[PDB]
Design a protein around this ligand. Structure first.
Ligand SMILES: CC(C)CN(C[C@@H](O)[C@H](Cc1ccccc1)NC(=O)O[C@H]1CCOC1)S(=O)(=O)c1ccc(N)cc1
Lengths: 99, 99
């Protein structure tokens, strides 16, 4: 799809059988979700934003469906005021900015 | 221009005769710059992010050049680890996300 930016660019995701919404965030290098259960081992990571530090769990090679498209990548779990899809996963959709 | 997202989407800006770089950030509702002098009256505002709070100065109807294109809008001045162009100004470029 093509979308304009007069509203937040929010898409539906499906990850570990759970349905959520997330913002498509070109300013985010990495994908961060709050409201979600993932199984398996993870690694502690810090990431750093307007406001400073957030401690997150890094889960590798997580299957995720974003606006209907199946990809696999790193998902960071941690407190974030909004679930965000970062460039790590947007590059797998072949996403572009246009103006 | 059309750009892909394998690297950060960084563009050149010109604002109050100062040249800077900024990230095109679809996850940001508002534009926030750190490294910059604007004249005139402003208003205190807070914005939350990964990591918590940032106190900013809101400057209205600021002329700014983004990747060559002249627009006028609200610019927030405050600590941010990176200068960001938010949707407030991306909508004035007719920017779209595509995948
Ligand atoms: C350059 C910074 C700002 C990068 N952030 C991305 C930005 O899009 C960020 C996303 C967000 C949306 C809603 C609430 C909170 C945060 N928007 C943001 O703060 O919007 C503010 C600034 C003015 O407009 C409102 S981040 O969240 O720190 C981040 C950092 C690293 C990773 N891996 C993921 C996210």
């Amino acid at each position: 799809p093509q979308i304009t930016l007069w509203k937040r660019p929010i898409v539906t995701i499906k990850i570990g059988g759970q349905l959520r919404e997330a913002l498509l965030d070109t300013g985010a290098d990495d994908t961060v979700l709050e409201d979600i259960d993932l199984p398996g081992r993870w690694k502690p990571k810090l990431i750093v934003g307007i406001g400073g530090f957030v401690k997150v769990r890094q889960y590798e090679q997580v299957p995720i469906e974003i606006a209907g498209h199946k990809v696999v990548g790193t998902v960071l779990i941690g407190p974030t005021p909004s679930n965000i899809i970062g460039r790590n996963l947007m590059t797998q959709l072949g996403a572009t900015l246009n103006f």
